[PDB]
Symmetry: T
Subunit: 152 residues, 12 copies
């Protein structure tokens, strides 16, 4: 490593049911696992002097407690809250409480689904939102975080 | 390999011609011409021929979409204010059956409640907002992956 | 018993209707808007109706054509397409020139998304036809003739 | 001779339409429902359409006539009058027999009270005609012929 | 001397049950008792009162059609059809006879769906919650509206 | 054979003092004073002592209801515009627990949609609207029957 | 052991069950369902009566006639579920406990079908379980009346 | 006569552990353990192996549904309060593609308006409410008929 | 020190119908009058060098005019607007116009009653709101005012 | 005179009190508030127990465990005020009276914060009065239980 | 003067007596008395006799409107908070049938959503908001033009 | 005491306002928009205001004229007519050039259909005038002068 940049510490958070990625009818719904996505993203981040940490959980409390633990340690969050996007005021208040900028990512286009999925407790306080672009959305959020923090 | 050339059209709606003009020290210095020149160069390196129209005239955007029929493989559109108001743009994109991604420089969800409604988001392949000029580059990268299966 | 007075009728078509007959003709149909308007103009001519037509993707062209109709045109048939749901300016142009009109849609607007159930013209139209394809323009013409000649 | 296949068409009229032509004929109009249906039956006969008709104030009579149309009728023209806004039972009868239909209203429902802007039939109709008076039934007949003969 | 008024009273579904269930708790007066007393009150003022109660929407619609050019005024308690029947509204609009809407119970004190009437905006007026006497008040109102008294 | 005397209070809200004043040939000639004089005489024949207040002052109506506690048997109220706006009048009538009938001269359901809401109708014994001045007489007759069980 | 009298009421269009494209939409008729249900009821000393009608008034008048004769009602009001306050008021007026049954899942259909004028006053509601829903309602009624 | 064994999972949401505890003489005496013991015995007589989880922890219900994938034939679920709030449970049941019936002991339509909405009812095979504990037995009988075509 | 000892002037405002407290069916609804509550509260305030003034009125104008008269004289307001909570924009604009901090108090739990009572034209601009704790709510508002003004 | 057992429950994110920009947003931690409140309660023969959690299940299970042990609950559900029907049903299920407390004025924030699944079944609600709100709820509970 | 004299009534609602009092260096120094003195002088130059009432008492505004009947040609009203709440004021102005203009110092559309509703705007000849004290002068000029056909 | 700095003010008029003075002049009035703007330009000139004007039925011409006003125009008076209710693009043009504006309507928008009660400009306007006819432009001019010169 010969990095001239200040290191960024970035946390990726994944919400409920995303552990199932790649393991129902892979020929129909797609083959990539969450582990595959995060391994590729961690490698992409490391080339740009970004240290990437990750948690996926079906437990709302684990996501809230990981956000609390990020206070004064993490520079940026990428979050795919999955179903909790629509329901969790507690996650909104955790992110407001630690004051870390974040990007919201969804694999699927939330606006093309049921009307209840059009509402997010996070989108109005996110720096931005990516939906419908599949796993590449995490890479775009990483690229955006680097640009937003380094002013590039 | 050698890849098949992709023809991609970028459409920008009203007021985006003002980019880089107002309080440049506060709101930013990049013009739309700067963004599109850089995006055109990025596309050319990946065998994508990128065409562009920005207009304050809804009819110019509709007619450009009509002209894309059987010629263009993918659209990137930032409809700006027309996102919230133009059923005619929705029906133009449905009429020519070209896949598209919707891009906004600013986070539409962080602004007035009327900006939370889009006539395009439910038929878009995807939507990017709040990531500034880089959002066009992300949409380009997404389109290439969607068309080449990469 | 007497020869009829000529009716001057204007047909206005809104955005995207220029695409009729182009996309997947084997699936969605082969008739172009030019084919529809040629047939309609011939039907009108046999009943002493002089039929004029404009299709445009430019809202201003439709507004200006309505302004130009003042004291010249007896009746309007309008398919505003997407502008049905969005254009107060077209409503106000039609109110401003005081010409009776019928609203026509090729497709059934009530069978589509909920935003298409609202029209800024339907409450001030003499009536509305939807879902009957190109024949809807012929029905509007027949209605206009009956409304003006009391037949 | 007729070289066409005969079409069997049923016209259904809902409540209060029996009053047509009765109240202040000099003000509101003189044509009765019987006059409208006699003229429509003659028009249909010229195009090898056999037209049957029921008007009723009884929701059950309309439902049972729809049930009886199964595998006998090719097309329905219905003016449900007030039942347009209230009858899920009529919607489910028409869904149950799977015969295509056109909805007709004499008056422009969009120009009246807001409760009249909702129909339990318009989203499943082939199309809807409103505000064109008695001629709306003729237009629906012409549409049915075109839809069934692909003309 | 007065000119005779012809008045029709229409009663909607379920009002035939009045006086039947737990009479010691919910009340003992039948609809037949109410209409006999109202007919006698009408007769004293040279009003010929006719009546139909039905559970059949079509019987009410057809009775309204039959009233055209025969009946001067209608008193109607549409019961549940108040909230649901556009057909009854259109029957009364179609024959153009003035009417008063009557409810025995206070419709505003019950479920929210009962707050909406398809008749109240075109009625001459509305009485609710005053029990059987509401029909007598509607009769007195009709006589005043027609005789200017 | 004497009845027990009933004490009944009639309350009239704002603007009802204008009755009979504007275009009498078009809108009608009877004043509120005419209506209340006739109603007081009707009540007196049935051993009802009828008291009356009309006011444009919400506080005068509220204070008159407070003063009715343990003195008045029944209230007839036409709150006029306050029907739609005054929770304070609802809470005064709930506070003194005297039964009341709500009366309107005009049909409130035939006017603007905001007039369809009453802060009193759900707690009234009943409601009369659209029957003109006779509505107060009907409310009086109902009160007498409700109190005397006739 | 003490006989129960139970009335099953079926609303409009349910006479079409089993008629249209039987290979696609199913073969069982309403008559088949009611014959089987009547036999199931008879084994438990329940006398089961039935009316299906497209006529709202026939359903209302059958409920009126049930007063002081019928112990329990099973009702599938079909389209009238969403529209008939008169049926609600008939069932409130005769004070007989009832269960609401739908063959299809009303919550999986158009949003107007999510509203019932009966569900809040029913003892309970069954939907989406096909013809077996009437048998479950019968078993529930027997348990509710015999305290079993 | 031979049947293939069915594996059925019953899921119970929050607060249902309280059943039978408060004022048994007033609210009823049966515990959730009593209901599940009886239901497990009923299932065993029809060659159904019935497994059960009740939890106040949303994650335990989600993880149990994930674990059911390719192992369980049918789910009976009473999500209790989570019926009205949990999109995550809806998405778990969509993700594992096992047919399910929704059961409530009480009539949800007779209670507050917020209880009228379910995140599960539109994707359930069917819904039973208001029939008390017997609703689980009806859901079991329905599941057997739906899987064995009887 | 001295800042802890300076006299506070506090105004209590009570809206319509609160003059009825203690009058109707005292065995059922309770016996305490508004005069009883205000006498006890005035004595509680006097022990902490708080001069407590009171107006109850059924007249909206009297409450508005009392608020106007409070300008530059009164340090804090405790208000129970009763029915006016739900209806009076004029009271909101009087309190905004004189810029005196206030607490909103209700004896009964407004959230347990009709849905129209769930809206207040004052709650969003109040320092805070107390409901459902009966007459003690006025004492809590007094204690809060003293803490807010004396920084204790 | 008879000892009262009172439980204080605090919902998610309240562990952050006093941490972020203490010079701007305030310095008092939840531990400071609860230590002072426990001492206040002890002077009046109230045994005060406390749980703060980010875990909805821990709050629900603590309410279940309060049945027939606890006389009164003071709860600040924080974000769960607006979302948790499960907490409402736990408190209804154990039938212990409670007061709802918020440090901040919920009515001064976003419109979604104006709705509480607890306020209509609480004995009362305090908001916007900072840490003193817990002390007022304690004073109210003592008065309500001792008839003082 | 060659013109017919116009009699105009200016009505000001609650809290407008506070104009000029709080933080004059920040919010402005002009009192309502200053505004009305200047407006009265402007009116007198055009043969307009101006009467004025400001009140925090709804009844005083209602009674002043009643007293205007057949005496006043035009009303200018700033109802302040009563714009949003008073049906009684609407019904007073309908009852006396004098044309009026509604004036607000501040832009009501830029404030809370409850201020976007007026019980007077739909029956006013016109509305002025956000132009400060000059709005009363514009309403006076409009009234003169509307009555004199100039 | 000091001579005033010249103000540059732009007046923008939306669709259909070109019809002013044309339809039923005996009923709706005889004044044309050209008459109104000539009088307003003269009024402005006496107070050292240079007044420029555009009326258009073309939304793009209004947007482009707003863009051209950047760093040249001190204040805008706009009557967007039907575009008041529909054009987010005009809102974003005015926000993008940061010029203060007043919204004017000849008619009382609050006395018409309920859709006219919503404006995409009123919340960001310095103020709004409606229902005062052509004099509303003069009042907006007087307000702009006071707002810019602190008079």
């Amino acid at each position: 490593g010969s990095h001239m940049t200040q290191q960024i510490k970035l946390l990726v958070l994944n919400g409920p049911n995303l552990n199932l990625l790649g393991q129902r009818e892979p020929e129909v719904y797609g083959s990539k696992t969450l582990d595959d996505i995060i391994k590729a993203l961690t490698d992409e981040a490391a080339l740009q002097n970004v240290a990437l940490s990750h948690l996926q959980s079906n437990r709302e409390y684990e996501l809230i407690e990981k956000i609390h633990d990020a206070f004064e340690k993490i520079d940026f969050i990428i979050i795919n809250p999955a179903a909790f996007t629509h329901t969790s005021v507690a996650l909104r208040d955790a992110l407001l409480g630690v004051n870390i900028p974040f990007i919201e990512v969804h694999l699927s286009n939330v606006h093309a689904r049921e009307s209840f999925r059009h509402h997010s407790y996070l989108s109005d306080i996110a720096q931005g939102v990516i939906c419908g672009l599949g796993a590449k959305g995490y890479s775009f959020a990483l690229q955006s975080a680097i640009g937003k923090l380094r002013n590039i």
